Fold:
Amino acid sequence: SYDRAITVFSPDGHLFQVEYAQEAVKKGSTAVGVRGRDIVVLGVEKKSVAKLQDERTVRKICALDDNVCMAFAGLTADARIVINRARVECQSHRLTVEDPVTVEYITRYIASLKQRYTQSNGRRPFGISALIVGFDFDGTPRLYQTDPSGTYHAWKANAIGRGAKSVREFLEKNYTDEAIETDDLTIKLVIKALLEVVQSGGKNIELAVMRRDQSLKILNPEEIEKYVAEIEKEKEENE
Amino acid sequence: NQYDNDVTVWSPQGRIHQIEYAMEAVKQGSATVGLKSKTHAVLVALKRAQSELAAHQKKILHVDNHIGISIAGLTADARLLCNFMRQECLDSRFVFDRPLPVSRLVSLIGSKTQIPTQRYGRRPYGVGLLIAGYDDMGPHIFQTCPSANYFDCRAMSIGARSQSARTYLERHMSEFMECNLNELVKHGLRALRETLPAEQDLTTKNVSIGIVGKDLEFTIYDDDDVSPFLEGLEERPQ
Amino acid sequence: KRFDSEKAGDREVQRTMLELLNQLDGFQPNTQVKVIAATNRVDILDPALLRSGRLDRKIEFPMPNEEARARIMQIHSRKMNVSPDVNYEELARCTDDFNGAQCKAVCVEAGMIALRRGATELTHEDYMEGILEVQAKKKANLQYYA
Amino acid sequence: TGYDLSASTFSPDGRVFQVEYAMKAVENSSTAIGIRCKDGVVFGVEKLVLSKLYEEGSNKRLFNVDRHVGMAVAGLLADARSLADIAREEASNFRSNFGYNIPLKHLADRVAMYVHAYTLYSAVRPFGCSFMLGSYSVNDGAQLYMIDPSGVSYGYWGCAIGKARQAAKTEIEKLQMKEMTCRDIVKEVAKIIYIVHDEVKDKAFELELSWVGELTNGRHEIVPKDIREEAEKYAKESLK
Amino acid sequence: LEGRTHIFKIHARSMSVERDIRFELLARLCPNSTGAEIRSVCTEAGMFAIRARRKIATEKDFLEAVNKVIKSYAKFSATPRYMTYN
Amino acid sequence: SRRYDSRTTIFSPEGRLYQVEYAMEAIGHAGTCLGILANDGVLLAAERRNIHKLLDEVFFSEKIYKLNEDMACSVAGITSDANVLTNELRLIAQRYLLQYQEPIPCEQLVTALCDIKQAYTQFGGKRPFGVSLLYIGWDKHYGFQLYQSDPSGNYGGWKATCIGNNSAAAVSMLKQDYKEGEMTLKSALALAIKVLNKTMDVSKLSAEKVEIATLTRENGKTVIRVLKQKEVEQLIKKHEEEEAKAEREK
Amino acid sequence: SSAGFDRHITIFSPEGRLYQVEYAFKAINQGGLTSVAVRGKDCAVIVTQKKVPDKLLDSSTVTHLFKITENIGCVMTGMTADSRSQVQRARYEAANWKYKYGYEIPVDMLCKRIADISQVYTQNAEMRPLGCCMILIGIDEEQGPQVYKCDPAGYYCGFKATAAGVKQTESTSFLEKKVKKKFDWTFEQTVETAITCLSTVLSIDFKPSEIEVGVVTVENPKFRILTEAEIDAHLVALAE
Amino acid sequence: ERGYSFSLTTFSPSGKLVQIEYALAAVAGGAPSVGIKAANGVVLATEKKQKSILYDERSVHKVEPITKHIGLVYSGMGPDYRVLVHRARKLAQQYYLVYQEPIPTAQLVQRVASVMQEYTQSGGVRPFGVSLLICGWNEGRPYLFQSDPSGAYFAWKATAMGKNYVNGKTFLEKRYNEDLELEDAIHTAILTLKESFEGQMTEDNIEVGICNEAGFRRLTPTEVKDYLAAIA
Amino acid sequence: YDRGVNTFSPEGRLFQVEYAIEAIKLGSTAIGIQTSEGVCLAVEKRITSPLMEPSSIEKIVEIDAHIGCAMSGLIADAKTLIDKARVETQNHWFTYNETMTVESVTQAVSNLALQFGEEDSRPFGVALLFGGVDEKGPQLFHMDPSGTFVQCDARAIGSASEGAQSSLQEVYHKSMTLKEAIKSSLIILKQVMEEKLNATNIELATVQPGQNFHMFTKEELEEVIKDI
Amino acid sequence: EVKGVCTEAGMYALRERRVHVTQEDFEMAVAKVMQKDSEKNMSIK
Structure:
């Protein structure tokens, strides 16, 4: 009848421990993000930090290179492996094929390794996913995703966690050419779509903007307040 | 039915059903009747396809010059042993520079399928191969089964509805050791067509025929090559 | 008698059957009025049943022979009117492993062929029809597989 | 309650029913017995026939492992040829390294460890087939050793394997082995083998015969029927 | 195939239905629905027809299939389609 | 009965970690430890599981293990499973000091054993490590760093720690006493005495049944101070003097 | 009572009791063999027997007495299938003592080496418990004779007089008062203690043929099996 | 749960671990062996009783010293003792010749019990129910340590396992306090050793090992009974 | 009950192999057609959200210069075997100096179809459609995870393949040219699709010996739209 | 258990045949209930 799932497929043609694993991404740390013709932005929050503990230890999002950055969700245990495992391959794509790392190459490695990660009885599957954030050579944007089955897909913006389709409905108005024409309105639009995600209290909010090929910098609680002021002024002048 | 899971574990009655389960896959394949005379041998098989526009998949193929074979059941183990048959046929064809008779050659195939039917974590192999060949003493027809038991015969048949073939074979197989090739081929299809339902063809592209001899190299007969064998046929009665 | 207890729903009778063994043990008059018993399967059989008063002759009835399946089905079909030219050779060989009740299933089927029926049975294919009905027919064979 | 599933593990009673399953699987095989005479060892096999079923004289259970050794086997034929090749590879090691005749006593011990090791590991399975080991030599002499799937190494003057091993060994005690010639020992088996294993159960069958000894100069080869006037010695007294 | 559209033929006498509808369009997209599920399809169709105040199923020509596709697929189950091929 | 089967390899079924929930249960079993923020130094505490006085106490530092001249750790969990991790990180810290001739930074150090513990919690059906051990030390970049190892592979490293489940009473105390920039390491040491005398089940702060290990930064020696029970006994009278002073108010 | 896989594996019960090993303790009892090991002053005598169901039984192969070394013999009990595998092993481990160490093994460590791998057989249940039982003897320098026994639970054991097995429980009970005495034992006294202890266990006292009696004494240190001629001579000597 | 599977060790829902816990229950059913750390030496008094009078204790030896200055005794079941004996015989002699000197026994307990840890802790198929009382003499100050199958090494001045483990540990907890006179500590250690012991005490019913600062000396039943019962 | 996967059934036959056929149902529906002049094939992208990029996931891939392909079922397992055979066609072009034939591509994957090894622990439920032009001209091949190989003039997979093969063999033309195959492709297309047709909803694959490759090019899908 | 101490301390005072109870007998009531506490020394330590 029903053996649940180990490796071999279930009678319905699908699996279980895979479908069971995607719910961990739903209960994991939420994240958002957007892209533009030059500058790109992202966000995570969901830190649950009380400030009484070390802030650098809870830091998760990192970057393999200034051009391509890593953004993941869920637990950071297996994600810390995804970091180091991709750092060795991105350094091999550094080493071999000296050109800047292409998103197709690096994503297939993690995907091909994420397929054998879920295969043997043997290597434990991933219960988490990740979304690559960066820019193509000559300023073109690139953002992709990952799947527990070891597949990759590209999006126009990063919406995951709770309410993936609800934020995607708000991303329909984000398809306009005005976003991002100026980096001041884009960050204000990031705090907009993020306002409907979780608490959005401004404390745990962490956003890093990458302009063209320049390495991104995490916004300190200085410019974030100014971009929140123009977002509140645009909301007050909208009536 | 839990005692039939492991091939290593013997049943309460000692009969392992994992071989009998693969016997079904051998008997779920197409109806094929092989036979041999003293002069030459004629082996026959059947083709079936998914749809009408889909070409009927062939079964009988050629391996050694003097060894023709048929096939039924799983194609995975078929082409695995087929390429394994190539390596075994080229063993003596290279080092000894002579072809291997079917007698001592299948003894290695029976041992190749012994390990998967013995050790734990392995499964038997359903195989519908009907092996032919000519050594100095004339033709030999063996059989392949998941039980890894090959018997030298003049005529044998496996697959679906093949129990009705043996009945037509018994008196005919003793009388088929004499006549030459041509009339033996059309008498071979006069068997399968009685086994198969009599209300439908039996076309040119759904049947497999092959002929091998001591001085005659094995040639695959399919599609237009079957037309000389299907001409001058006696229709089935009602 | 199963293994452990309690309890079986028929345990009152499984004690009474063993009481019958006691009646065939201690009661001499039970040697009179022979009683006949029949079972579907010997999977559960009491070892204490061995005796002349208890079960003595025990016969294992296998699947009837191909000639036996033809004789039992001919006695049942002697009343019906069947189309002529019955060789009895093919219908006997086409019967293998089939139970006597499945033979009457073909016999009861063979009684419907008179009028129309309306499907065309013609002749000599009648027996092999309901013979394959239970365990056959493909269909598959190959499709979805190799 | 699941105690008889694993062959490697024992049962609460102190044994393994898997060995009993392999022992009784030999009981389901056709009758094949053996006997040793003074100057040789007699082998025989009764091959069942249902329809034809194929060309007569092939796939016989008589196997030749070594020059002076021979095989009378029963049970499943693939494992019979497998145990024939296991002994053939064992006889190949003794002939390679040394090159002289392997003694049958130590040959049975080498095959004993093989069959025994197959019963130790639950990965592989105990073979449900049995065989008859026998040999003759000028310095060694005639020996007949019986090996069982459990791995017990031993031998008797004669043994019985088949549907019934009791009635088959019943007349061997009154049979005169030494004084009567080996050719007469062959007919002593051929007579009762036709008597017992009645034709009602199996309509058609054939009796294989093989012998090795001084008359063959130590070489083992299957002896046909009409040879050595055995065809007439077969049906002479077997009609009773 | 032709059996499911015959159920829609008698169901044309139920609800409010005319002969202008194309039944075989979506009938091949929901196999093994028997007659019970498509009965609930024509049932919940009238449920939305009262909520939307509409009447005749051809009015409503194209948008009857709109409530036919969303209700039938929601009754089977809800599974993400991206993980299927992934 | 989907989660009742023994697996330990693949995860559970709603997305929660199968064994890690049960691994934290073993951490809250007979664990004791504490941590606090201290400038120009750091302090840790230990508790002897056996209060029997017949013990030789020849183990010297037991619940506190010294993995480096400048760094140490505090084992909370099964001592048998942790002794494998002791020499493990000790050799990994030694092969790093061998390679670069420079003290191993505790950033990658802690994450190294966390990934080593992660491999045993990932595949092979291997038993997870049910021991959570602390980390203390100093580096040339971030200076004083505090970490806590977790079985799942995601470290519980913070500037504070909770060991074991009974220490949850001290967590509300540490968050209320949270301070920045004042040391005076004895301010937290006297506070750690209040942790053992109140939040911990054992009162009076038995000296032979506990241990206090502190690390004071010294260039370049970085002296690690095993106390052990010496002046802890006067700290008992010091904390009781505070209790005798507090009762004078009311 | 059982919980989990403890039926198929050797892990200990909640009462601290092994399962697959405790079922192999009576696995020797199912062999139906009584070997009593008793040592006198300068000598030690091992008494055993065998059953002859069929007249075709060969005394050579079915003989249960096994000689590991010229100076060191042994005897087994229980199932004889696994016993032969341990016989050739004891010959191999004694040869390692001859090769590496250069001289003859005291056999006190041979019991340790055999039981150490016998403990590996008891370690993993996949390789089967190997329920054969081993009883050893030998000669050590200025130690006089010795007696040793190893069952397949894997320890080294030896004492003055130790016997364990199927019926050996009734033999050791009678010998406690019989062996003491405990003075210098003549060869005729040691043989007399072999039949009298067998007379308490069996009291059949059948032909000396079927029973096998070995002896280890210091005159020529080599182990020797008693000849059938002298066994019947000592049998009629103790019974007047 | 379950949940821990095996390799190296089994699972428990609440505390410790099930399975081999049952082997730990067999450790208490093993042979009781007392031990004594007194002044400049370590004394070990075990208990050995044969099943019948046909056995002579001169063959089987329960005390098998690994080194000349380090003896040992076992509290627990059978040959799993003798397994770690030859192990430690290989284990301790390797480290002895690495630096060519014995080095204090503290490092011996570190290395020798390190593989014994893995050997007992890691999956051995069937568990191991043999514990040990570790002894030795190091730099003038000897040591008495107690291991177990779970791999927790202890330090005791007077210890007992097997029988009396409930009675004798509380006995030595009360009557014995801190460090006392050497032979006077042996007295009360034997008094509680004969607590649950049989009323019949003979030279062959027990054995007493002693670790001198001059190296270990294994006694014999002869000198064991000729000393005192009551040995002091 | 108690299904033994690769171990056979009490009846018996393989089970998960049949479940691998069900894994074709969850995938996108691709309908291939082989014609004398070339081979045309179409499959729906089935965009879930506007965030999805149309060329990100494509069901048509190129094994060799003259060999096209159409995947089915799972993606990652497809591209595995896809890139695999691309290396197999590269080694075949070295030793033999000639490009690998579409025929031998099948048996190359068919040997590894069901390994019961580390791949093929769980087997891959990916069906493969092999198009291209061999020495015999344009050909279209179909295979399944079990390793079946049958040459089909027109083959369909995916969800609607049931209803697609119905109207397929009826309107199929074996002896005609690509001129009719153009409009013959959109017939079955507009049938199975319940939404408006655009370049991002589906994708076309047409390979011809004289016109290639092609494959396909940008903005030729909307041209077929307005040609209705 | 305090009620149990009063009962155990009242049983021995009943044995001595006195109208009152001595606090030393209350210590005897504590010594009776201290033997039942948990389990040891196997498993943990």
Observations:
- Strands of chain D lie at 32-36, 40-49, 62-63, 69-74, 130-135, 143-147, 153-155, 158-161, 204-213, 221-222.
- Chain D is about 30% helix and 20% strand.
